[model samples]
Target: MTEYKLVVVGAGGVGKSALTIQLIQNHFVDEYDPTIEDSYRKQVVIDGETCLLDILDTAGQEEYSAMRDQYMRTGEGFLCVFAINNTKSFEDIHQYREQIKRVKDSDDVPMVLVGNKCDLAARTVESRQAQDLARSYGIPYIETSAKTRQGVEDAFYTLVREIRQH
Candidate 1:
């Protein structure tokens, strides 16, 4: 049995936790609950393939930046998420990519640039910009809506298939 470690990285409030929950549970977190803690793990099976997914729902508030190093180091693949409606989150990808490189020690680690919260596209900030950045990095990019279950499976499966093929 082959196993893969996938890390979800993005700023807080950008829906990293929501995306993780949606992907694993197929539901959204109701109400604003800050008392809830951050980060969790789940195992899932897609297309009859079983794999353990350690979902690192990180706090994107800059205070927990240190933890990013540890998470990136252990991750075999990454889903770098950004809120489609938030331009700052998209701009922050450069820094995130740098951190991943430092921790993973390579520029070629398989990664997917995810534009989360596609359900709120009317408020979108950088759609084409995000795509251009991802293309320059040679990584596949997709806009997803965890709330609508849109592109959730496609994103994960595409990354898994790419990893397998490589």
Candidate 2:
């Protein structure tokens, strides 16, 4: 089976671990420590191909900035996530994207711009704005909510598909 290393990156408290845990453990974790990093693995079929997904759930806190370079180097694909209700989180996405590209040393990387926490009605980042950013980056934009499990699979699967095509 083909193995894919997917890394989740975002600003602090953006539900990075929530997305990963929901996919790997199949449950929503309401509370999580913001300072620690975790990794998980799962075997699943995507587009009729069975493969192993090695997901690294990263710490989004500022202190973890040094740690990002290491994971970015090893990751084959990235889920660049942001919280819809938080404008600051959404604004920080560009930094994460730039860092990933700098570390990967490639302009074209398998990446997805994920707007998480869609379950919340209040949104600071509009859908069109996010769409525009994704279009500019030439990447897919997916809205996901780890709490309700909406669009979670699509976000992760789309990244996998990008890696496959790359």
Q: Pick the candidate with the highest TM-score.
A: 2
**For residues 66-92, what per-residue lDDT tens digits would candidate 1 score against the true structure?**
666777887667888888777777877
Please give each candidate's TM-score.
Answer: 0.85, 0.92
Cα lDDT over the full model 2: 0.83
Q: List the residue pairs that clash in candidate 1.
A: none
Where model 2 places Cα greater than 4 Å from the true spot, the runs are 60-66
What overall lDDT goes with each candidate model?
0.74, 0.83
Model 2 C-alpha lDDT per residue in residues 72-96, reported as the tens digit of each score: 8987788888898987777889887
The positional error of residue 36 in candidate 2, measured at the CA in angstroms, is 2.2
